[PDB]
Amino acid sequence: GSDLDASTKQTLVRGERLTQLLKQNQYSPLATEEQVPLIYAGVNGHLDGIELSRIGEFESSFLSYLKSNHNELLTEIREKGELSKELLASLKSATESFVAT
């Protein structure tokens, strides 16, 4: 119960979301095409704004959003195994649109 400045709390805050992002329940594996997006959102700090309790709401809903709309994008990441400049910009637009939750 140390007093924490803003520089320290950027780390602590960033981390807590990441920890929750890691979080998984038992018996629900997923394919690589659909773990490449989720990791972009955590590392590139799209969850920093999103509340800690609802990271898990967001993970699931984001995945339903992409299945309808950006299913072309996911097939490309699966088939080619790399995200291009074009794939990176597309992925970044997708996270953004859904960054409200």
Partner 1 sequence: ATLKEVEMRLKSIKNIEKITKTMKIVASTRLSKAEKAKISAKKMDEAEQLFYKNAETKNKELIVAITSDKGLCGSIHSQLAKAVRRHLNDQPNADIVTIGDKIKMQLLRTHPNNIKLSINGIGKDAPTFQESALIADKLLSVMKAGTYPKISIFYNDPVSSLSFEPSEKPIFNAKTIEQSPSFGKFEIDTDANVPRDLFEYTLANQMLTAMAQGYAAEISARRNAMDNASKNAGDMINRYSILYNRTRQAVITNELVDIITGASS
| Binding residues vs partner 1 (CB under 8 A) | 1-3
The answer to whether 70 and 94 are in contact (CB under 8 A) is yes
Shortest separation between residue 3's beta carbon and partner 1, angstroms: 4
The answer to whether 94 and 73 are in contact (CB under 8 A) is yes
Shortest separation between residue 6's beta carbon and partner 1, angstroms: 11
Q: Dihedral sign for Cα 71, 28, 55, 2, please.
A: negative
The answer to whether 55 and 20 are in contact (CB under 8 A) is yes
Shortest separation between residue 99's beta carbon and partner 1, angstroms: 23
Shortest separation between residue 64's beta carbon and partner 1, angstroms: 33
Would you say 2 or 28 has its CB closer to partner 1?
A: 2
Would you say 4 or 39 has its CB closer to partner 1?
A: 4
Q: C-alpha angle 69/27/43, rounded to 5°? A: 55
Would you say 3 or 82 has its CB closer to partner 1?
A: 3
Would you say 1 or 29 has its CB closer to partner 1?
A: 1
Largest CA distance in the chain: 49
